[PDB]
Every structure is written in structure tokens, then in C-alpha cells.
Amino acid sequence: TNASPFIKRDRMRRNFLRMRDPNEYNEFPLRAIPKEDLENMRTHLLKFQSKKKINPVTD
């Protein structure tokens, strides 16, 4: 009805306490470059920013 107008906490505490593969591929080796040639040598990446084809070998 009124879903219990009262806050029942005095005895509700007691109640709870009371209740308780086939070779169809190609495989190649991968070997690291010798470090003896990487010293005093820097390898960078070059990116041409353009929409056409740029090739310094021929262009």
C-alpha cells in the first residue's frame, strides 16, 4: 500500500545477521646487417611531397 512509511533499521540489522603446412609459399632468410658498417653511418627516410612521380634516377 504505502510501501512501508517507516525506516525499519532497528530490527532489520538483526534479521540479516540471523539469516546467515604444404610448401605452397616462398621462405627467405632474414639476417641482421653487420654492425661494423652501421657505425659513423646514419640511415634516414626521404619522402617527396608531391602528387606526381618523382624519380631522381631518371627524372
Partner 1 sequence: LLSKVAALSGNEGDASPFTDITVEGISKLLREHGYQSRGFEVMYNGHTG
Partner 2 sequence: SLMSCISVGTDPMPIITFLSEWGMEPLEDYVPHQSPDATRVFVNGVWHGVHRNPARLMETLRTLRRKGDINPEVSMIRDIREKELKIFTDAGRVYRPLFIVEDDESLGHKELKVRKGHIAKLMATEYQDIDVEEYTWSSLLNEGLVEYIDAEEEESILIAMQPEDLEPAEDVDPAKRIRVSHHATTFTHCEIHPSMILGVAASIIPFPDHNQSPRNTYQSAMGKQAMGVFLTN
Closest separation between CB of residue 18 and partner 2, Å?
A: 11
In angstroms, the CA 55 to CA 41 distance is 24
The residue behind cell 540471523 is 18
Q: Indicate whether 51 belongs to the interface with partner 1 (CB under 8 A).
A: no
Q: Retrieve residue 48's grid coordinates.
A: 617527396
CB of 16 to partner 2, least distance (A): 6
8 binds partner 2 (CB under 8 A): no
Q: Which residue, 7 or 32, has its beta carbon nearer to partner 1?
A: 7
Among 48, 45, 23, CA closest to 59: 48
